[PDB]
Every structure is written in structure tokens, then in C-alpha cells.
């Protein structure tokens, strides 16, 4: 699968993976800089702990970097 990967925020080929993931959470700067975003690929959807969100998907480049919409 091809997925976007942080911190380069580029699409890499992951020959042995088959899901992309978007992991997001707040650090102390979440109000001014938005959530932290970890993009990557895995063989299966990773687990995250409380306070962290993860969304997984199974098509090439299905995890584009989600910037905050600036009102």
C-alpha cells in the first residue's frame, strides 16, 4: 500500500503494509497549532491509548494530511 508518512508528509511505498493510518492527539499547543498528526502505514491498524484518535483506511494514499480549516 502507498501511504502518506510523517514527518516528511510524503507518500511512501509500503510493500509489506496494507493499511494507512491517521493518528491524532492534542499536546499543550493544540489550541494554537491544532492536533498533532502521525501518518504512516502498517500491516494492520495500530492501537492507540486514551485521548488519541486513529482512523485506518485501505486504499493508496487514503490518509492525506488533515490540516485544520482556518475560519
Amino acid at each position, epitope marked *: 500500500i502507498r501511504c502518506f508518512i510523517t*514527518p516528511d508528509i510524503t507518500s511512501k511505498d509500503c510493500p509489506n503494509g496494507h493499511v494507512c493510518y491517521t493518528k*491524532t492527539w492534542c499536546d499543550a499547543f493544540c489550541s494554537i*497549532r*491544532g492536533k498533532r498528526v*502521525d501518518l504512516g502505514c502498517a500491516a494492520t491498524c495500530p492501537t492507540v491509548k486514551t485521548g488519541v484518535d486513529i482512523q485506518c483506511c485501505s486504499t493508496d494514499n487514503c490518509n492525506p494530511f488533515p490540516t485544520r480549516k482556518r475560519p
Partner: antibody
Amino acid sequence: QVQLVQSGAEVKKPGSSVKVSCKASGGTFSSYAISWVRQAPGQGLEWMGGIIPIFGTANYAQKFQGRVTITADESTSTAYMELRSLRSDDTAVYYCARDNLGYCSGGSCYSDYYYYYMDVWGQGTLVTVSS
Amino acid sequence: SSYELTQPPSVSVAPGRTATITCEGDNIGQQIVHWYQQKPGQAPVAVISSDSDRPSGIPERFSGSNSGNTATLTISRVEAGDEADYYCQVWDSGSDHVVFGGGTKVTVLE
């Protein structure tokens, strides 16, 4: 720590343009944003704009929008400010300055831009406009 | 158009007393204020970040506050070498501008 090293003094005619460089030595940029801040003789600090290379997005002050271009060459860790249509009150010392709050760290990046305090400053470049 | 920061051009302080430099803005307490010191012929140096934090190495006698319509840089027990210009600074997300105050020269009396 990383340093920012700017190009030398420029002497320009009115109507001409100038391009000043800012090399991030002792290190690199990429995850860090770089602003340009000028200071006319005897006056205060004035933001020109800045660039966040990891998002390829530049932000400009209204006073200079349409006259100014800020770029960054991530391979040489050099940022540039090009200021066009020069006039006499563009005479100033021009600084580059790093945003203290990096956009990426340890496998993740922030998702919005917000210019934080400026921790590392270049030595400044004197630009003089006259005939 | 852009958010306004108002600093007094100048402050006089007797040696060893307290210097207070205001930075006024419309509900500036909603903003995050940074402060820079600058001496003649030198580049600026951050002395307060995020209203009230001191960067590593900055003396304890520098402190900051921000509430309501006024942010304040306080230099306690002021010393000769604290004579300098001081600039407050914010990022105004509404206009996508870094805004500097006009700067305050702190003169330390003999």
C-alpha cells in the same frame, strides 16, 4: 545550536529589487519556520512575512503584499527574501528569524500554522535604497 | 485591519527599582504575548515568551503578565545593563500577521 547567516549589504536604486539570503548553519531548517523582520534606521521592528517549508506556505504582511516573495531551498537550508519596487523607506536592516516552535517532532507534525516567538536571529543585512 | 499593540515610547527607572513596560491591545489577554530586548547595533533577544515564561538563560528579574486590555513586562531590581529597547509581539491569527509593538526604551537613571 543552529545559526542563521545572512548575505552582505546591498545598495539599490529606487525601482530595483533585492534578494537577501539566510543560511541555517550549524544545522538545518525544514520543520522550523523562518520569518523576515526589518528595522528601518532608528525605528521599530516590522514583520515582512515568513515561510513554513514543510507546508510550502508563505505569509506576508499587508504593507508588502504584492512586492515581496519569501522562499526556502530545503536542500541547502537557505531562505530568501526578495523585495521589489524598492523606495527610500525600504532602507533598513533586514533580519531572518526562526520560529521557536517546530512544526514536526518525533514522527508527528502540527496541523495548523501559528507564528510563535522568534528564538534564533540572523546577524542582519543592511539594504540601502538611494540614487 | 490588523491588531494594534500600543507601547509607551519610553520609561525611566531609577537603579534597583522596578521597571514596568505596558503593551496594550483590545482584549490582549486573548493573545499570546512575547517580549524582546534589543540593544543598539545588536539583534533582538527574546526575554519573555507566552506571556510569562523565561527562555533558558534569561535572568529571573524579568517577568511578564497578560490580562484584559494590558500585557506587562516587569524588570525587578533593574540594573544598568537592562537599559535597552523592549518590544512586545503577538501573532494575530485573524489577519495572519505577526505584530510588533512600537518598542519602549528603558533608561536607567544615574
